[model samples]
Target: SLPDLKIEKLDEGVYVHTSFEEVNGWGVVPKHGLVVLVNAEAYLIDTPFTAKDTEKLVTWFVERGYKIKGSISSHFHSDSTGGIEWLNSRSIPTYASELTNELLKKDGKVQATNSFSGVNYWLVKNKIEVFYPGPGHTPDNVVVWLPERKILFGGCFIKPYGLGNLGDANIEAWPKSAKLLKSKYGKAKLVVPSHSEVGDASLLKLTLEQAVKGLNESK
Candidate 1:
């Protein structure tokens, strides 16, 4: 689950840094994280699966002439907060929604450097938007919206394939969040899921469709 962080560029200065982490019986599954450099500055959407991998992920960009100025953890899961400590150690401010910080405290885990509440938190001036569409994978999960790039880094909230682990899910709100995502970003050119291959704009619609059972059960 180390030494294998794959870096893929979705567009100019927009990258998805993937890390392999074991999931109980799922073998080594890849976890997706994003790094944006459109403003010629480094901005992390999610951290690699672990601190070590996070170091590599950061170093990959750090050595390339970019200094990471800000970051956002999608949620409180390790897959999202794995590198928060390291980022904090380096004094690079990282953030999560206010709700997410509470979740971290609930688990006695390290919290982000900063927390903000509301529908949008701009990590990068006008380029990046951290949108919290209620809850799904976790009560505080968020997706990164690259307005100008038309990229939706859906984090773990939008799965590219099947219905994922629902251990920490709020089944009732998932469909709503999915619908909200589509309603707000139907024009997104690329939808990036944290645990699967990036897909076309249809990914949001698929997430809604996949949670049909949950929606019916909610009623």
Candidate 2:
């Protein structure tokens, strides 16, 4: 067991794995990502900050006799793919948006094993749908939609209200993108943000509000 690893069950086979890291300006920060289990096979939405934390997550499932199908990065940021190398070393396939793949390649960072340009229903049992709801935090931020469970793994694409730090976002377009996502996943029961508390669809609406406010401030 990792000293700081915290795993919480969200549904029958969905969980959130949280670990900590020290960001340059954010100080010590706790990072939350998702893990979905489908018929003894597991899929990671994003990874913890370091390989060590990722190893702990892998071990937890391995010891429990679960097979890790692969991992999917929500975008090209380090927070999303920090442990891609570690996972790839374990022979686990990592996937991401084609735009994210291009961005990582340009930056010479580790790239996903598989890249998809549009919507992709990756897993068989769970039907994990990776949807690129335009761009917000990055040029390729995507969300994982589990239609069966009505869960939206919004990642950095959606944030809690009042946190106007866009990071490296296309501020002018973020509101439109957020609105598109809000309409697309109108039925999502639970929404998980990359770095905040989980909430309902209202979180997406609030993110839109924040984006609109950001755009207005820039104007």
Candidate 3:
């Protein structure tokens, strides 16, 4: 077992995986965050568990001469966004969809223990320019697509080993998203979901076919 957090390589980037054993029963089903070294700065996607964890990830990037320039939350859940403040303190900008921003504002307080870092992630307005083919997660959930390298930074929307977290899942929309991703990026050489160490795009195809077919017949 990894001491602090287990780091995995996905494409040209590195992904850090973390889990709260207490929250997730006994097994370590982790949440992932990725760091891409571009030019000289770092571009991060999804913040892990807490401020400390995110800080550690940022430091990891620094060791590779990769300073963080900005961050993008996979979605707006506390687990995904808890590290926004920590990144903000270091002047690292953060972004999420407008819908996600609205949800967080309306739903209310998600305070951190040490407000010293404090969240400052903002909502993105311009088109993020990429492809998101699947819809098996939340209505507002979107995946990250890097066209040049054919790397897809899919989030909770695509769980490879098994199904996704059904708590906030729109089962109907989930399949749609999956199909869209497949049709659009099916040829992708690599696909990485923010959770589950499941690698390869074929898993996405299996998930989409099985899930969408089941959901369709149920109706």
Candidate 4:
């Protein structure tokens, strides 16, 4: 029912929940979050840009009678962690890595209530995995793996095609991380980035190639 929010079911148990915010020069920019379902329970990936928008996101599930289990952001960006304050206020049990915990605090952002490291096998048993693929778009960027569906939520780490705003990246290390990321999740059938159109494994390949290309050009 939200005018600025869009949700598309990508598979039987996975859905893409997208919301928009105007980014000055970029006009209206859209950010994609994930809502994963296992039976009547729902899990969130990233969140909307504002609490109001995030409310719409949660409301979608509330009206549908789905129980929201928890949420995890890809990194520390507002686009990634924006709705957390509200999620936390509701005590929905949000999770974050130890690295992002410091980054989130350093940047004066809201912290996720719970902590998880390396690969979190708890969130929803075998349904979700949050892994830190070294450092790329940001120092603590992590991607989500949905094994049951083979969906990789790369966030800003696997750009559909941008090294945009290197304000918080290891320029020299991004490509290396991209390589490691691809090597680890080579079996992914569908790859989605926070800022671009979703694609197949080729999108991840392009991310690796572009990361290397962008790094070399800086030399």
Question: Per-candidate TM vs. native?
Answer: 0.95, 0.94, 0.79, 0.94
- Misplaced by over 4 Å in model 2 are 1-3, 119-126, 163-167
lDDT per residue as tens, model 1, 1-219: 244788988898899898888788888888888899965579999888788888888898889989888789999998999899999998999899899899999999889989999988887768989898888888889999988889999988986466678889988888888889899999999999988889988999888887766557556
Candidate with top lDDT is 1
Q: What overall lDDT, based on C-alpha atoms, would model 1 receive against the true structure?
A: 0.87
Better of 3 and 4 by lDDT: 4
Between candidates 3 and 4, the one scoring higher on TM-score is 4
CA-lDDT, candidates in order: 0.87, 0.84, 0.63, 0.85
Model 2 CA lDDT for position 14: 90
Cα distance off (Å), candidate 2, residue 60 = 0.3
| Model 4 residue 209 lDDT score | 88
Q: lDDT per residue, candidate 4, 61-164, as tens digits?
A: 97998888898888888888888899999988787787887889998998999877774445677889887778889988999999999999999888756777
Number of backbone collisions per candidate: 0, 0, 12, 0
Clashes of 1: 0
- Candidate 3 Cα outliers beyond 4 Å, as residue runs: 1-3, 13-21, 24-27, 109-135, 213-219
Cα error, residue 92 of model 3, in Å, equals 1.3
Error of 4 at 116 (Å): 1.3
